[PDB]
Design a protein around this ligand. Structure first.
Ligand code: FMN
Ligand code: A1ELG
Ligand code: SF4
Length: 363
């Protein structure tokens, strides 16, 4: 209950602790996880990706081969609405974010859906989101947060936003190469010292000074309060963490509770992705099936991401990311796709969100 961490302002919103639970798709950070995180005083973040899978396609208009048909159903507005409402049954009006990647042609629709669902913050990476305010202008109080990989991206985004909208971002998350999910770095660059988070944060904070010290949130490989304190000492205003929350009871993808306590370091690796960025995965499920010659068939139903071009890149890399992540949410160990941060092997227990926040914030 006693902490020396200080509340963090993001636009017009305040969070008690300077910690974001990072968004995780598909079906990983929905209502149970994000609601309980926000209940604790950190930023809970609802993933807006693949919401058509929620409660086994509760809210889709059309299904093909047990998949949400095309992007209107893969990014399901009614599912998103119910996820936000169920989160707020837990956390009330405590701030909540919505995470949506940029590499989708329906980006604006899903951003406005997130706002209309009640999001207080929009977080967007996997691209250079130079036009978030275009889609958010009917919702003036929703704070807007790009995820970036470099100080150069901060400068470019601030200039484009300032010139076009007379607005700059409310915060930036800088994500490093030890993160879960996709990496904002080429595979080779993921192992270079120059791209370590401890080296990125000073440069991004220095770049931020020119635009009035927009708060910088450090993400990727942050495990405990020692790492939080390091990142704050380097000029970050807060941290975003996901792998620790991936190992909590309240995670909405229940498979992880059984998978992480077994997970060995040598079974974490970077793979190719139809999104076009390296993804950090667990060497299990669909990955193993591909190597056996038992790969699930690929035929684009959900049309989840623009770089894939309706199956072109999925066929080249060997797997559909929408199908695999949906299968994981629905419980499929044999054919699911599973992501993790580099630190995933350090999960031994599955603990509650409350005990995790206590660990991270006490003192
Ligand atoms: C399983 C998993 C799924 C993720 N999915 C997303 C996602 O859909 N969108 C996003 O912006 N980041 C995603 N991430 C990145 C996290 O939000 C976060 O920035 C990163 O994992 C933080 O590093 P840490 O896991 O070491 O704390 C994902 C991470 C994990 C582990
Ligand atoms: C600028 C830049 C570039 C690359 C990475 C970062 N860093 S980042 O924005 O924090 C991210 N890290 N991992 C991410 N993963 C996803 O977006 C993702 C995960 C699952 C499903 C999904 O949707 C589907 F199925 F593909 F349609 C999308 S995004 C920042
Ligand atoms: S085939 Fe490509 S675009 Fe279609 S759902 Fe799969 S990964 Fe997404």
């Amino acid at each position: 209950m006693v902490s020396t961490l200080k509340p963090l302002k993001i636009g017009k919103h305040t969070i008690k602790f300077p910690i974001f639970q990072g968004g995780m798709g598909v079906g990983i950070s929905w209502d149970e996880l994000a609601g309980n995180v926000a209940k604790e005083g950190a930023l809970g973040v609802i993933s807006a990706v693949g919401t058509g899978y929620y409660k086994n396609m509760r809210f889709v208009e059309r299904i093909v081969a047990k998949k949400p048909f095309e992007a209107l159903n893969f990014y399901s507005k009614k599912a998103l609405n119910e996820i936000f409402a169920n989160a707020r049954k837990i956390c009330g009006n405590n701030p909540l974010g919505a995470n949506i990647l940029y590499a989708i042609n329906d980006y604006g629709r899903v951003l406005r859906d997130s706002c209309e669902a009640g999001a207080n913050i929009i977080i967007t990476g996997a691209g250079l989101p130079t036009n978030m305010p275009e889609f958010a202008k009917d919702f003036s109080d929703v704070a807007l947060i790009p995820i970036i990989s470099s100080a150069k991206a901060l400068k470019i985004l601030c200039k484009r936003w300032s010139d076009r909208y007379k607005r700059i971002p409310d915060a930036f998350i800088v994500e490093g190469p030890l993160s879960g999910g996709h990496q904002g770095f080429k595979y080779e660059d993921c192992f270079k010292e120059e791209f370590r988070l401890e080296n990125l944060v000073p440069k991004v904070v220095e770049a931020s000074k020119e635009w009035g010290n927009i708060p910088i949130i450090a993400a990727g490989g942050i495990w405990d309060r020692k790492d939080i304190d390091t990142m704050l000492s380097l000029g970050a205003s807060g941290v975003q963490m996901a792998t620790r929350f991936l190992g909590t009871k309240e995670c909405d993808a229940k498979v992880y509770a059984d998978l992480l306590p077994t997970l060995k370091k040598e079974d974490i690796l970077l793979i190719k992705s139809p999104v076009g960025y390296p993804a950090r995965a667990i060497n299990t499920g669909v990955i193993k099936r591909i190597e056996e010659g038992n790969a699930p068939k690929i035929a684009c139903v959900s049309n989840c991401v623009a770089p894939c071009n309706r199956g072109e890149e999925a066929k080249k890399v060997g797997y559909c990311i929408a199908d695999g992540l949906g299968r994981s949410y629905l419980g499929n160990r044999e054919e699911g796709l599973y992501f993790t941060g580099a630190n995933g092997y350090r999960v031994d227990k599955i603990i509650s969100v409350h005990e995790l926040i206590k660990e991270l914030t006490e003192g």
